[PDB]
Amino acid sequence: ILSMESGKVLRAAIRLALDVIKIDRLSRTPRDNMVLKLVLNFFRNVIAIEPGEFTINTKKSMPKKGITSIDTLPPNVSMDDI
Amino acid sequence: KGMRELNPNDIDKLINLKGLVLRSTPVIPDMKVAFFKCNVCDHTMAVEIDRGVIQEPARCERIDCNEPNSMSLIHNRCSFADKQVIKLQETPDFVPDGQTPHSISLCVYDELVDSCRAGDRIEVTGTFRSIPIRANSRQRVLKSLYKTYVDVVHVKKVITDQDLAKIREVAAREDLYSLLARSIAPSIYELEDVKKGILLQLFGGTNKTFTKGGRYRGDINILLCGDPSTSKSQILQYVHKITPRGVYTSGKGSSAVGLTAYITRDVDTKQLVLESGALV
Numbered sequence: 001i002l003s004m005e006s007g008k009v010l011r012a013a014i015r016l017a018l019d020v021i022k023i024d025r026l027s028r029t030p031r032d033n034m035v036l037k038l039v040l041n042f043f044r045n046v047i048a049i050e051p052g053e054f055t056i057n058t059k060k061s062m063p064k065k066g067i068t069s070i071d072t073l074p075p076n077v078s079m080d081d082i
Numbered sequence: 083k084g085m086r087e088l089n090p091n092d093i094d095k096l097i098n099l100k101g102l103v104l105r106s107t108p109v110i111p112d113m114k115v116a117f118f119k120c121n122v123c124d125h126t127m128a129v130e131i132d133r134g135v136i137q138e139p140a141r142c143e144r145i146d147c148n149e150p151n152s153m154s155l156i157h158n159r160c161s162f163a164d165k166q167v168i169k170l171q172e173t174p175d176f177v178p179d180g181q182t183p184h185s186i187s188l189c190v191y192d193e194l195v196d197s198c199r200a201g202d203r204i205e206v207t208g209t210f211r212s213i214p215i216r217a218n219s220r221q222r223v224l225k226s227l228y229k230t231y232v233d234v235v236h237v238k239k240v241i242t243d244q245d246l247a248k249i250r251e252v253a254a255r256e257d258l259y260s261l262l263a264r265s266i267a268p269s270i271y272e273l274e275d276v277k278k279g280i281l282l283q284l285f286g287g288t289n290k291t292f293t294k295g296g297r298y299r300g301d302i303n304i305l306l307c308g309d310p311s312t313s314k315s316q317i318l319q320y321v322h323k324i325t326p327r328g329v330y331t332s333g334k335g336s337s338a339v340g341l342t343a344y345i346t347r348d349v350d351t352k353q354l355v356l357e358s359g360a361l362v
């Protein structure tokens with residue numbers, strides 16, 4: 001989302017927001033408010049996404065080998081990208 | 083002390099030895115301070131090494147993170163020192179009844195590394211240490227016989243302005259040529275021209291570095307051919323002593339390859355190497 005075509009998805013969402021707001025306040029229907037809420041939720045989702053957490057089963061004791069790494073990133077994604 | 087007079091009584095005591103260097107291993111990195119990094123919190127700590135043992139931590143030293151057995155050794159961030167192993171052969175004189183001379187191993191660290199070359203006579207002061215040998219790789223079991231070696235702490239390989247002021251005084255002497263020609267070979271009698279010719283070989287010509295061509299070297303070659311009983315070999319030995327480098331090769335005792343260089347193989351490295359002949 002942040003990389004493809006320099007993130008023009010955000011510009012498209014903004015354009016939808018402009019189309020919604022253009023109509024008058026007293027003429028606004030619930031659907032317009034739904035669309036505005038959808039755009040805001042889209043922005044919140046884009047901002048909020050963050051790397052997960054490393055969960056490990058604890059049925060038995062810690063082996064003497066121990067934890068090697070807790071990296072939880074996809075193959076092609078590095079920290080700086082997100 | 084002699085290499086054949088070291089007894090168990092003299093273990094862990096400072097001794098003095100003299101011998102001939104036979105072979106030295108390349109530089110060996112010896113760990114000094116280890117470096118550990120926690121795999122979870124990426125916390126780094128350095129721990130010391132005592133008696134060849136790493137004082138590893140059981141769990142991360144941080145308070146918030148205490149995951150056990152999560153510490154790993156970063157090999158390339160630990161401090162290291164220099165180690166080298168040398169083999170010393172006792173001087174031929176010490177041999178009692180003409181047998182294979184004994185040898186003693188030496189260890190040198192830090193500055194003394196690469197201080198003695200192969201085929202040199204040195205006097206070394208160090209501690210006569212003893213250490214066990216493990217019977218096999220995969221057990222703590224030890225052999226009852228201990229290996230003996232020496233921990234070297236000192237090695238000695240066996241111009242001032244005043245001298246320059248002194249040397250410049252001789253040059254002013256008018257009869258310098260005769261003085262040097264008479265001092266090069268004191269014993270030989272009435273061979274002043276031969277001595278003079280020999281002397282000019284020691285000094286040598288002048289060196290020239292020359293691009294657009296090749297280097298020109300000022301080296302002089304002299305032939306001494308004459309009647310047998312005259313002092314020819316004596317002068318050869320006399321000059322052989324003075325020069326810093328030289329090989330006393332003879333006739334029918336040297337070979338074409340022996341003079342220039344010999345192609346061989348290094349057993350330790352299993353690579354093709356070449357030795358230096360008499361001329362080289």
Ligand SMILES: Nc1ncnc2c1ncn2[C@@H]1O[C@H](COP(=O)(O)OP(=O)(O)O)[C@@H](O)[C@H]1O
Nearest residue numbers: 269270271272309310311312313314315316317
């Ligand atoms: N002018 C001289 N000065 C000193 N010693 C001489 C002289 N002439 C002959 N000798 C003696 O004679 C011997 C000649 O032997 P050497 O020098 O081996 O002869 P070559 O090497 O030519 O066969 C020497 O041992 C040397 O002591």
Ligand SMILES: [Mg+2]
Nearest residue numbers: 310314315316
């Ligand atoms: Mg001769």
Ligand SMILES: [Zn+2]
Nearest residue numbers: 120123142147
């Ligand atoms: Zn930690």
